[PDB]
Design a protein around this ligand. Structure first.
Ligand SMILES: Nc1ncnc2c1ncn2[C@@H]1O[C@H](COP(=O)(O)OP(=O)(O)O)[C@@H](O)[C@H]1O
Ligand SMILES: Nc1ncnc2c1ncn2[C@@H]1O[C@H](COP(=O)(O)OP(=O)(O)O)[C@@H](O)[C@H]1O
Ligand SMILES: Nc1ncnc2c1ncn2[C@@H]1O[C@H](COP(=O)(O)OP(=O)(O)O)[C@@H](O)[C@H]1O
Ligand SMILES: [Mg+2]
Ligand SMILES: [Mg+2]
Ligand SMILES: [Mg+2]
Lengths: 461, 101, 99, 155, 392, 523
């Protein structure tokens, strides 16, 4: 959302966009890491090193950081009862956002929203099944995980019942009207017997479209298109509530959450194509006139809906962006069940691996690998700067403790939680999240180091 | 039309209905015909052949002052109790001399 | 084109060729009505099609095409003719003899 | 082990030749036209069915009617495919693109082994794999910038 | 300077170029368009006086302009404005008790009491020299449409005011019938005695439906069956009207199709029937209450019971701005009346229209509250002396 | 980013003018509506530069902020905060704006004290949790004994209307607000109470109608009043139907058949009205327009016809008469009709309105607001809307707290008691949270002209040792008991003032960089 007209800084926008499209957790850390590799390459440029020689030295240095990151990695997620590694992984992503008041409540929402929609046989998660809706009012603690769908209810009759206990949902895609063809007709009326046949044709058509729903045993109808006024009163006489003007992908989520089928016509309705749902009701929020749908009970649904509430639209649109990062880190655990320990613990441990292999051998790329290890320490020392500590005082203590003994999950924190052990503080990050942070920042540095000319124009006109 | 044989009977009917009115308002003795509408070039033939004066596109305020002063009746269409073309020929105006100077 | 909303629905194969023949026969109907008085010079104010020139060619008739309206009223007094607007309503007094 | 039906036909209800005027005279024949318009589209879907073609590919769009018909019969479809991709798809599976659905047989359908819709880079991609008589290939590039992948494509 | 009988009028010329002379305080403030936000609330104060009372509307600005002027010294003496708002309510509740003791209970049957009330409101306007004619006409236009001793409300929308240029203010009329500004087509008769008036909302023209209708002509004799059957259709409509017994037709103004065609006009002229076109849809309520007619929509229900009655329905050929209609006398007249306002200029008629409405609103206040006080600065002195003793 | 700026027309600031423009723009919003808080606060008059300025005086803080159009980026968060407060509870939009501004004013005092801004966020989260327990433990519930609940509802409407233009009308407008929600007898739809504003008369002349008022008067030749009638409403088309077959023409061969079709069209329109009068009704309400051909049929049968009332006008008539919409007339045994006593027409402000006097099952009301100017009627409508929305939620949540500064000192006492059990890093941020809660009775006390430095000091000394119901008495200017005077507010209103201001001050305090983009068409 910047208006930066600089082609070097425009590549940093696409770098943070590429992290969001692939993983979606380290979009902030991939820009500080790329700016750290270029700052260490500035002093290497004054010493006479070629910029491609620094870029070839960063590839031999980032390869050590990938292989060292795969040393300690284990998870015991079974998606049945061992959701405790899944909650603590989402708390690391949600801990940096403004949802720390709901740090335990909203973390359990994003865990159960993924496991109910993910295909564990293919390890594929579809985010189209997870509907993220937001409405102003209430508080952040009123955010609930609604198993089902939440749409804008548009009961055409104001005397419609606003609560269905056991809903046999009849999903249809045909408007409540006489059937209009797709071509030009220009139907001819000649005598008065043909005009009286027009009245009996539509009178029996509205009685046919209503009886074919009641013969299937349905007590709720969903329609994509509009309703006629003559069809509205026939819904109240037959005790058949129905909504009007639902969107495109909204009714696609109803047929999965209720187990029904979307029927094109009225003649193809049957008892097997009906959906099953429990508490179907509309809830008015304060003084507004929205009346969104709340689906409490279901039966083996593969589609959930998160209803985010708040005090203003600034806290809701951020929570839509904060919880989407929490939905992505659970998706990355199904793609790869290996984790690391964040809080700067993985960056200090990877900086020691490049420094150990810089002496094996220090032929040409010795200075390029030490500039990579000094730039990997910028991310944990930025956590020490934002926490009110000292960067060079705190980083020297943590890095020295990993050499004197075997290197544990040793990082830092804000309130510091007592000890600096990341295994005890439950700061868990994904392996492929930090694996793509080092891989994308190295390749973006190589495309901005291997450039020796700028051919930009002058004024606009 | 659904048959090409009935094409020329409709094309000639647009002028035969027109010439039907012009022959029953002229055979009753009318010599001066004033019209506030429009007399096209086809209808001007029936007055030159019969020797009648036809004045076209006159004012609506001038027609009322002539018909009231000469005893004529300001007629707009066909009338008089489901008649085809009657024109009520006893309600024609009179004049001593109509001369263009 | 007539002063109406005439539109023909052509369903059979013989209907389109019949309309193009009725357009030729309509010109031959009015050209046969003007040669019953045996004229020599036909003078009009509007256009003359090539099919109307074909019947006047073999009947040895000299046709003038686009004479003005003010020139037609002047030749009507010189030759003693009457300007008619209907070919099937021609009479012997409408022919300008004495020229 | 799916079969691919490469098509050049519209699977919509509104398939009109833009010159048809269906003049009706009575209300008994008026309902017969609307029932015939659904029977025209459903007859095309029965030609794709009963042939093993679980995957449908067409360069012309597919409406909401034929999308829900394949979901009930457990069949996959993909509409508005570019013509450069269907030419590569024809040489991959070894089939042929059939504009008319009446001439569908076992000699015009494709054959592959693995057909999934992955989530590479956030966007979905329907990839075909496993066909040994593949006269073509597809090299998917993954990079960190749009100008980075354009240089990788140029290289 | 625009208050009282010795006050002068004001003329406000707007940006469009329509300059009007006005003396009523509600009409002045709506045309001045004051840009100050505190002065626009005084415009809406005189607007609600025209709605509730009608005759209080320069005086509500003199009071509210002086109550705030008295608050100039009050705010420079350390008095909080909430204390001034509490004390102004106590002076208001004591002020109504002083005006109630000065009130005299009257009855609407006394015409001389209602005549002096309407003459008082006309003394400040331009029609003070015409109080011998307009003030008797203002009482008779109210006391015949209220049905007194049975209701405490009166709608002024049942009193139509027709503005016509020509003559003087002495040429005003209080015709109790219907006055229409439309012309008569055809105008060959323009007078009928013992007339029966019928309101027709049907369109006397060619047959057409709400659905799209077309005529198929595919025969030589089929063109004869189009024109001659359309003439026989409207002939059945005119003969259905003529056999009812009516002489005056009122056709509602149609927008979709043509209401009265040229073919339908010729049959109605031969039946000696006066036809009036272009009657608005918002004016049919005033017509049916005055004459007593009923709105006839379909031609099958056009019977003699839905007609009206008129002793004289003629088009009065005026010497001024054209001519109008004037129905004189009707069986069982409703609670409606029409006032014809004349004038030498277009500016005097707009002032005479506002002065008549200021005169009808005075008698409107006597229906709601049958009490009156002395005028000419009389109750303002008693409100000044009794509240001074109340303040001590 | 200022040094070697790579932006075209956009500017930004980081940690120097970011919190400077955020604290200036948010305090100036709170200091604007500071004078409108309390029962003795003045009102504002909002005006534009021209081109139909449409002046609208409002005392409620949501309507002031939604029309000013602030150019400050951080001030729009407090504008959007008061918009949600009006949409959720309908009250406290001014109280949530001053409280969110006093938190950032105390946070500006922590600039020179070199306190980390994340420590103030962690200090205010523990302060807000202690303030939720103060309101929850002091909430007074009301179950049975309904003669004390109706007296409690008059204290809610008396507290809300005291801070508005209806100052010396609490003997009348409290009964107009309590009995309006009491006649709903169900859900707070907040649309059955149709407020009609008419000029002329004082605010004491306003009243609550026992029936229902409407416009679009009864036909031309139809009766104006029918005693003991059966009301049937409708939502169907009367004339020019063009019934649901797009692409259907009348293709005939002669003009005599067109006269047979248009007579057959009017026979089907006559047969539709004949199906309506088989129910045995005397009044007819259609949402759509009624043309002249069915209007003559209702007038000949002695049936009323109210044409084109409103889209939401048939909903209020269905709740005040006890019928149904009934857009299809083919089953008279399955259509429930309304009930009334008098359908006479009344005249309010020289306008004839249809009065539905004596209706049965009347779950709808009509408030006839009469005022001196249009500016008073626009203010009294929003003042009544701020009172009916709280009573529609007080019947759903019967928990009430003692207002008038008593609830704020209870919340500030629970924070100060837990500020002494904390280390000195977060205890300074908790003391600034308690000082901002004491500013809300300080604004109320200083708006009347009282000694605000001593009255809040007497409230803090009272709440420190007992006196859980002690508050500010704005009548005499002293400290009194809130249970005796009857100054109470709803629990959900006072919770949303505390919770939304704590969340909105959390967002602005966490901003260290304001990067605004280049605007369009601004040169
Ligand atoms: N409790 C904690 N203790 C220490 N460090 C933490 C803690 N929680 C989060 N962090 C650190 O904060 C950083 C936040 O990175 P983030 O901005 O979310 O990356 P991205 O922008 O890719 O989502 C992580 O790298 C993590 O190491
Ligand atoms: N004959 C009279 N003698 C003395 N005073 C009069 C006479 N007639 C009218 N007035 C005064 O002229 C004033 C006119 O007030 P007006 O402008 O009509 O008030 P509003 O604007 O409210 O209608 C009245 O207050 C009345 O006292
Ligand atoms: N009778 C009273 N005694 C003491 N305080 C009162 C009284 N009436 C109202 N108040 C106070 O005046 C304040 C008015 O706040 P208000 O502007 O209505 O907030 P909002 O704009 O959110 O509705 C309330 O916080 C309340 O405590
Ligand atoms: Mg994060
Ligand atoms: Mg006066
Ligand atoms: Mg309030």
């Amino acid at each position: 959302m910047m208006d930066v007209d600089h082609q070097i800084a425009k590549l940093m926008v696409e770098l943070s966009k590429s992290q969001d499209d692939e993983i979606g957790d380290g979009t902030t850390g991939v820009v500080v890491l790329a700016g750290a590799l270029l700052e260490e390459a500035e002093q290497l440029l004054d010493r006479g090193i070629h910029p491609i020689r620094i870029a070839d030295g960063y590839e031999q240095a980032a390869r050590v950081a990938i292989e060292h990151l795969d040393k300690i990695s284990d998870s015991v997620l079974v998606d049945i009862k061992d959701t405790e590694p899944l909650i603590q992984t989402a708390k690391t992503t949600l801990g940096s956002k403004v949802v720390n008041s709901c740090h335990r409540q909203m973390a359990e929402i994003a865990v159960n929203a993924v496991l109910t929609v993910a295909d564990m046989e293919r390890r594929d998660v579809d985010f189209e099944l997870i509907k993220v809706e937001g409405k102003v009012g209430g508080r952040l603690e009123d955010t609930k995980l609604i198993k089902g769908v939440i749409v804008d209810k548009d009961f055409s009759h104001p005397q419609m019942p606003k609560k269905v206990e056991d809903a046999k949902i009849a999903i249809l895609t045909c408007p409540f009207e006489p059937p209009k063809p797709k071509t030009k007709h220009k139907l001819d009326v000649t005598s008065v017997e043909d005009y009286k046949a027009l009245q009996k044709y539509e009178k029996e058509k509205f009685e046919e479209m209503i009886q074919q729903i009641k013969e299937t045993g349905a007590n709720l109808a969903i329609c994509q298109w509009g309703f006629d006024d003559e069809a509205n009163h026939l819904l109240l006489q037959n005790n058949l509530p129905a909504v009007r003007w639902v969107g495109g992908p909204e009714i696609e989520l109803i047929a999965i959450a209720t187990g029904g089928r979307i029927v094109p016509r009225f003649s193809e309705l049957t008892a097997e194509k009906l959906g099953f749902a429990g508490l179907v009701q509309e809830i008015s929020f304060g003084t507004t006139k929205d009346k969104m749908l709340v689906i409490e009970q279901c039966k083996n649904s593969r589609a959930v809906t998160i209803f985010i509430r708040g005090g203003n639209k600034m806290i809701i649109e951020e929570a839509k962006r904060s919880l989407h990062d929490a939905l992505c880190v659970i998706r990355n655990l199904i793609r790869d069940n290996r984790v690391v320990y964040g809080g700067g613990a993985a960056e200090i441990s990877c900086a020691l691996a490049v420094s150990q292999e810089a002496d094996k051998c220090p032929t040409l790329e010795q200075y390029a690998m030490r500039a990579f290890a000094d730039a990997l320490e910028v991310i944990p020392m930025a956590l020490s700067e934002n926490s009110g500590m000292n960067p060079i005082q705190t980083m020297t203590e943590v890095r020295a403790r990993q050499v004197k003994e075997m290197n544990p999950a040793l990082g830092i924190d804000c309130l510091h939680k007592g000890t600096n052990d990341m295994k005890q503080q439950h700061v868990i990050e994904t392996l492929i999240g930090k694996k793509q942070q080092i891989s994308l920042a190295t390749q973006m540095v190589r495309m901005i180091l291997k450039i020796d000319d700028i051919r930009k124009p002058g004024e606009s006109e | 039309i659904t048959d090409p044989e009935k094409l020329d009977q409709i094309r000639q009917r647009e002028s035969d209905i027109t010439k039907e009115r012009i022959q029953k308002i002229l055979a009753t003795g009318a010599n001066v015909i004033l019209t506030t509408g429009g007399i096209d070039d086809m209808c001007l033939k029936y007055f030159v052949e019969a020797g009648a004066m036809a004045v076209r596109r006159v004012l609506k305020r001038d027609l009322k002052r002539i018909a009231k002063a000469s005893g004529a009746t300001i007629l707009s269409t066909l009338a008089n109790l489901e008649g085809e073309e009657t024109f009520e020929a006893a309600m024609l105006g009179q004049a001593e001399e109509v001369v263009q100077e | 084109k007539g002063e109406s909303q005439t539109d023909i629905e052509i369903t059979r194969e013989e209907d389109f060729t019949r309309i193009l023949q009725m357009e030729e026969e309509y010109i031959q109907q009015l050209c046969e009505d003007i040669i019953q008085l045996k004229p020599d010079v036909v003078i009009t104010e509007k256009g003359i099609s090539d099919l109307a020139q074909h019947y006047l060619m073999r009947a040895n008739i000299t046709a003038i095409r686009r004479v003005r309206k003010t020139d037609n009223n002047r030749i009507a007094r010189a030759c003693g003719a009457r300007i008619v607007s209907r070919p099937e309503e021609l009479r012997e007094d409408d022919v300008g003899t004495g020229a | 082990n799916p079969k691919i039906a490469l098509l050049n036909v519209e699977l919509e209800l509104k398939a009109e030749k833009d010159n048809a005027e269906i003049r009706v005279h009575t209300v008994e024949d008026y309902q017969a036209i609307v029932d015939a318009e659904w029977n025209i589209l459903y007859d095309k879907l029965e030609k794709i069915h009963h042939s093993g073609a679980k995957v449908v590919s067409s360069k012309l769009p597919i409406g909401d009617v034929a999308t829900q018909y394949f979901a009930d019969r457990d069949m996959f479809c993909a509409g508005r495919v570019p013509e450069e991709d269907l030419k590569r798809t024809m040489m991959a599976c070894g089939g042929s693109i059939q504009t008319s659905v009446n001439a569908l047989s076992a000699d015009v359908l494709g054959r592959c082994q693995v057909f999934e819709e992955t989530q590479i880079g956030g966007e979905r991609y329907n990839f075909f794999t496993g066909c040994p008589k593949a006269k073509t290939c597809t090299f998917i590039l993954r990079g960190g910038a749009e100008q980075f992948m354009e240089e990788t494509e140029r290289s | 300077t625009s208050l009282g009988p010795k006050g002068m009028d004001k003329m406000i010329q707007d940006g469009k170029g329509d300059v009007t002379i006005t003396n009523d305080g509600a009409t002045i403030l709506k045309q001045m368009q004051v840009l100050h936000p505190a002065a626009r609330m005084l415009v809406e104060l005189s607007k609600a006086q025209d709605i509730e009372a009608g005759d209080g509307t320069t005086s509500v600005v003199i009071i509210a302009g002086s109550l705030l002027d008295s608050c100039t010294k009050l705010l420079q003496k350390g008095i909080h404005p909430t204390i001034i708002s509490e004390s102004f309510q106590k002076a208001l509740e004591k002020g109504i008790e002083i005006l109630t003791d000065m009130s005299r209970p009257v009855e609407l049957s006394d015409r001389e009491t209602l005549l002096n009330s309407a003459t008082t409101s006309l003394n400040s306007k331009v029609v003070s020299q015409y109080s011998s004619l307009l003030s008797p006409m203002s009482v008779n236009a109210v006391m015949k449409v209220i049905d007194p001793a049975t209701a405490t409300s009166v709608d002024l929308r049942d009193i139509k005011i027709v503005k016509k240029l020509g003559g003087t203010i002495d040429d005003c009329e209080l015709v109790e019938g219907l006055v229409l500004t439309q012309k008569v087509s055809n105008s060959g008769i323009t007078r009928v005695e013992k007339a029966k008036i019928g309101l027709i909302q049907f369109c006397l023209s060619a047959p057409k439906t709400d659905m799209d209708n077309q005529i198929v002509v595919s025969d030589y004799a089929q063109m004869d069956r189009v024109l001659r059957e359309e003439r026989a259709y409207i002939l059945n409509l005119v003969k259905q009207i003529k056999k009812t017994g009516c002489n005056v037709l009122l056709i509602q103004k149609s927008i979709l199709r043509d209401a009265l065609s040229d073919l339908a006009l010729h049959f109605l002229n031969k039946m000696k029937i006066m036809v009036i076109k272009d009657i608005e849809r918002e004016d049919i309520e005033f017509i049916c209450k005055t004459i007593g007619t009923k709105p006839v929509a379909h031609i099958d229900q056009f019977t003699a019971d839905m007609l009206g009655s008129a002793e004289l329905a003629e088009e009065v050929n005026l010497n001024g701005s054209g001519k109008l209609l004037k129905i004189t006398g009707c069986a069982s007249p409703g609670k409606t009346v029409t006032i014809v306002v004349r004038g030498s200029n277009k500016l005097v008629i707009e002032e005479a229209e506002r002065s008549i409405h200021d005169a009808l609103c005075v008698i409107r206040c006597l229906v709601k509250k049958r009490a009156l006080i002395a005028g000419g600065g009389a109750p303002e002195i008693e409100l000044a002396l009794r509240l001074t003793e109340y303040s001590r | 980013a200022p040094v070697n700026i790579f932006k075209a027309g956009a500017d930004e600031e980081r940690a120097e003018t970011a919190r400077l423009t955020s604290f200036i723009g948010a305090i100036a919003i709170g200091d604007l509506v500071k004078s409108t808080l309390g029962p003795k606060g003045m009102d504002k008059i909002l005006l534009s530069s021209g081109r139909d300025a449409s002046l609208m005086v409002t005392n409620d803080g949501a309507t002031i902020l939604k029309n000013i159009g602030v150019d400050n980026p951080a001030a729009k968060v407090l504008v959007d905060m008061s918009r949600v407060q009006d949409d959720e509870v309908g009250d406290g939009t001014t109280s949530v704006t001053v409280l969110a501004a006093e938190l950032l004013r105390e946070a500006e005092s922590l600039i020179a004290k070199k306190i980390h801004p994340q420590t103030i966020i962690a200090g205010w989260r523990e302060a807000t949790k202690a303030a939720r327990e103060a309101l929850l433990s002091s909430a007074v519930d009301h179950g049975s004994d309904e003669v004390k609940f109706r007296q409690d509802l008059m204290n809610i409407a008396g507290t809300t209307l005291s801070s508005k233009l209806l100052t010396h009308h609490k003997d009348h407008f409290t009964k107009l607000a309590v009995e309006a929600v009491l006649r709903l007898k169900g859900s707070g739809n907040l649309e059955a109470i149709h407020i009609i504003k008419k000029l002329g008369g004082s605010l004491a002349d306003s009243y609550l109608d026992e029936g229902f008022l409407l416009d679009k008067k009864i036909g031309v030749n139809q009766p104006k009043r029918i005693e003991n009638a059966k009301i049937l409403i409708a939502n169907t088309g009367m004339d020019t139907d063009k019934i649901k077959i797009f692409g259907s023409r009348v293709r005939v061969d002669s003009t005599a058949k067109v006269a047979e079709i248009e007579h057959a069209e009017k026979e089907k329109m006559k047969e539709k009205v004949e199906r309506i009068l088989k129910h045995g009704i005397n009044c007819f309400i259609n949402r759509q327009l009624i043309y002249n051909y069915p209007e003559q049929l209702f007038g000949a049968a002695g049936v009323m016809a109210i044409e084109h009332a409103d889209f939401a006008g048939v909903e209020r008539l269905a709740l005040v008469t006890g019928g149904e919409i009934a857009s299809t007339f083919d089953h008279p045994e399955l259509v429930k009709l309304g009930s009334c006593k008098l359908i006479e027409e009344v005249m309010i402000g020289e306008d004839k309105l249809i009065h539905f006097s004596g209706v049965a099952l009347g779950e709808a009301c009509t408030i006839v607001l009469r005022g001196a100017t249009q500016q008073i009627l626009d203010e009294a409508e929003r003042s009544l809307h701020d009172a009916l929305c709280v009573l529609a939620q007080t019947v759903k949540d019967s928990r009430t707290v003692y207002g008038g500064g008593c609830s704020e000192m209870l919340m500030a006492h629970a924070v100060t008691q837990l500020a002494n059990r904390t280390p000195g890093k977060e205890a300074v941020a908790m003391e600034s949270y308690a000082k901002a809660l004491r500013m809300l009775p300080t604004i109320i006390a200083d708006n009347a002209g009282y000694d605000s430095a001593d009255l809040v000091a007497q409230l803090r000394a009272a709440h420190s040792e007992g006196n859980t119901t002690a508050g500010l008495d704005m009548r005499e200017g002293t400290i009194g008991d809130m249970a005796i005077l009857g100054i109470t507010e709803s629990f959900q209103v006072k919770r949303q003032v505390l919770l939304s201001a704590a969340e909105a001050a959390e967002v602005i305090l966490r901003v260290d960089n304001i990067i605004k983009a280049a605007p369009r068409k601004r040169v």
